[PDB]
Amino acid sequence: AWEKQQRKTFTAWCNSHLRKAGTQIENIEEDFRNGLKLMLLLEVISGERLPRPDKGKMRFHKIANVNKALDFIASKGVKLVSIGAEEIVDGNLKMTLGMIWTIILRFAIQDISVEETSAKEGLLLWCQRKTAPYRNVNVQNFHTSWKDGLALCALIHRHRPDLIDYAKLRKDDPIGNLNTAFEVAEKYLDIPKMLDAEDIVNTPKPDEKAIMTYVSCFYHAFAGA
């Protein structure tokens, strides 16, 4: 169950950035094998220029491109473990998802700082501060606390009360609450849908890496304004 959620969410997150470079991926376990869109993804999110990609379709050129991507990530303090270019190139879903998570964590979550609290813990505190006024919400983690959709709706309502009629939302309509939040974020906040409502409501403990990935988009979207 963790793999399905991470595949959907990580793919959508990558696409939310790749669109700025005029491209997209579809199958995360295949579309980064030659390293080209992986290098592009890193340039988009970092605002920096990576080395030029290799010229050639041979397997060793793909390995070289993936190594350029991995070396860049490592230069940002990321300690790559077990992740090898050969595996990314030949195909390994688990390793690929692990690599993309390290990227999401380093570039979208690690530098978040709220009240002397950083990264994951800081993002959580931010969510707690924003949803404090809502009695039917209780953010205590990045999994079960988000299952009924009220926390996400509240997070949006706190910044944009004009976008959601919070009083109409009921805890017994989790799918509806989640979709309402997903739709509003997509249409008005330019945050692509990254979570599947059914998976969130039916999985006892939803994947927190996927939820953190999606929620981090709201932090950055609201941090600007």
Swiss-Prot record:
Protein family per UniProt: Belongs to the alpha-actinin family.
Shown segment, full-protein numbering: 42 to 266 of 901
Region annotation Actin-binding: where it falls in the sequence: 1-220
Annotated source species: Homo sapiens (Human)
Cysteines joined through disulfide linkages: none
Gene: ACTN3
Lineage: Eukaryota, Metazoa, Chordata, Craniata, Vertebrata
Calponin-homology (CH) domain: residues covered: 4-108, 117-223
Superkingdom assignment: Eukaryota
Name by which UniProt lists this protein: Alpha-actinin-3
Tissue expr: Expression restricted to fast (type 2) skeletal muscle fibers (at protein level).
Subunit and interaction comment: Homodimer; antiparallel. Also forms heterodimers with ACTN2. Interacts with MYOZ1.
